[PDB]
């Protein structure tokens, strides 16, 4: 379990992996935010919309992390 677990950890921390896994989540986000604006919305948000609502504020916390955990 130690050679295999070293493979999963070193893969999912490589920067090219961490790029394309943020990219297939941005291209997954963009498809969802397309569906909620093209299709109708009711008074309460849809299941598709709630995932979009997650993606914006969780990106907001990350954007504040880039400010706080910076060099100055």
Ligand X SMILES: CC(C)CCC[C@@H](C)[C@H]1CC[C@H]2[C@@H]3CC=C4C[C@@H](OC(=O)CCC(=O)O)CC[C@]4(C)[C@H]3CC[C@]12C
Ligand Y SMILES: CCC1(c2ccccc2)C(=O)NCNC1=O
29 touches ligand X (CB under 6 A): yes
Q: Which stretch binds ligand Y (CB under 6 A): 8-16, 20-28, 30-38, 39-47?
A: 20-28
Dihedral angle of Cα 21, 30, 56, 37, to the nearest 10 degrees: -160
Interface residue with ligand Y, options 9, 11, 23, 35 (CB under 6 A): 23
Judged by DSSP in three states, 47 sits in: helix
Asked if residues 52 and 68 have their Cβ atoms less than 8 Å apart, the reply is no
Q: Which stretch binds ligand X (CB under 6 A): 3-11, 14-22, 28-36, 64-72?
A: 28-36
């Amino acid at each position: 379990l130690i050679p295999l677990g070293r493979k999963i950890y070193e893969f999912y921390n490589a920067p090219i992996v961490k790029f394309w896994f943020y990219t297939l989540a941005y291209i997954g986000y963009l498809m969802l935010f397309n569906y909620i604006v093209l299709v109708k919305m009711e008074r309460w948000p849809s299941t598709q919309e709630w995932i979009v609502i997650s993606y914006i504020f969780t990106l907001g916390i990350e954007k504040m992390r880039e400010i706080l955990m910076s060099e100055p």
